[PDB]
Design a protein around this ligand. Sequence first.
Ligand SMILES: C[S@@+](CC[C@H](N)C(=O)[O-])C[C@H]1O[C@@H](n2cnc3c(N)ncnc32)[C@H](O)[C@@H]1O
Ligand SMILES: C[S@@+](CC[C@H](N)C(=O)[O-])C[C@H]1O[C@@H](n2cnc3c(N)ncnc32)[C@H](O)[C@@H]1O
Lengths: 198, 198
Amino acid sequence: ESLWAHAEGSISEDVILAGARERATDIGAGAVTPAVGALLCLLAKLSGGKAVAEVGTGAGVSGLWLLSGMRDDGVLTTIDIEPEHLRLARQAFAEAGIGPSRTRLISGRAQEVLTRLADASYDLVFIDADPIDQPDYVAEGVRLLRSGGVIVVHRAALGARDAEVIAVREAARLIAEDERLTPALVPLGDGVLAAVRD
Amino acid sequence: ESLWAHAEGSISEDVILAGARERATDIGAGAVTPAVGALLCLLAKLSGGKAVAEVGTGAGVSGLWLLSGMRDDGVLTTIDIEPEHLRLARQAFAEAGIGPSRTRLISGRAQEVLTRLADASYDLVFIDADPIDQPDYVAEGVRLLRSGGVIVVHRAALGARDAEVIAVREAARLIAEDERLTPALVPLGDGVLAAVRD
Ligand SMILES: C[S@@+](CC[C@H](N)C(=O)[O-])C[C@H]1O[C@@H](n2cnc3c(N)ncnc32)[C@H](O)[C@@H]1O
Ligand SMILES: C[S@@+](CC[C@H](N)C(=O)[O-])C[C@H]1O[C@@H](n2cnc3c(N)ncnc32)[C@H](O)[C@@H]1O
């Protein structure tokens, strides 16, 4: 527990991220912790960082962290059902100086958007929308990953009969039994499940 | 804290790893937790997994985990000051079916061995010997990393005036201020600091 607090407390954020967090709490949208963000940046950088897809833009906190680990020519495709959240995220990306060609924001239900994105074309897929939908996102997410890509599920550790906890464990099951995936659970924020494809 | 226990408890190990752990406790050598091991395997796989260097072989627990994420043609170079620990690790690698050309075990003080290994030739450097020596290992370790390689420090979170805690923080300082490194702290086991080179 002291180990966990030490890790969470390891990271400080700039004024842009602070502005994005303020907007996240106003709209009642979650936001990953700074230490989760640092991990997302590391994993984007390890993954190659050219094409990253995000399910659940929020106010752009996770997107800013992912972009700081991506290549200059990299494109973050981020998906949200709420146009208002997308507008706030686009503002944060603008305030950070992110070139407009490095982000592609898509308004809609991610269960439908993901099907339209090209198989084996993405270096990292980050899943951070409703946990009850994690199983659908994992099935579609894994298909988008090229060889050596990483799928990253936030809220991976969340009554043992709840419909939402059934979905989280069922998604962890999908990853644990997929022979093409090499996974590790990371106790940061609400819990991060990461897995590399073969 | 419940998050951390959930992560640590996520992983089960085969009978070979169990044999290696038994030998580690007999010789009084540490061994990374299973959840740390799963993370090392993920990071080796992300790093490319062709040339991995390890400082502090122990009885081979961390080495077995690293090897399971490396390529078939990959070579784990592991270094220990104790020939007895190397003999136990070599036995575990043998019991796991690891081809002898996939491991290179080197007997000696790692402060001297690392200097002899070739700069920018390694995909992952794992540091898990005495914490008081972490600053020397980091300076030498980073030099061995090719572009996109990962340095991984175990016991990264360990009185605030102790010579050993000064060294740990001083090594975390070296990584945090190195512009070529992208780091994240991970609260697993005794604490894992990972950082990707540019
Ligand atoms: C936890 S917030 C995202 C926070 C963001 N990842 C961050 O760290 O900054 C969850 C987001 O998912 C969105 N969402 C919920 N259901 C969705 C769906 N079916 N498709 C796409 N987005 C959805 C919500 O509008 C909300 O913005
Ligand atoms: C914590 S144990 C290693 C455990 C191993 N990494 C694992 O998880 O299975 C530390 C090891 O470092 C070795 N060691 C201590 N000082 C060293 C040095 N200066 N150079 C190389 N090895 C050293 C010890 O012999 C011991 O085997």
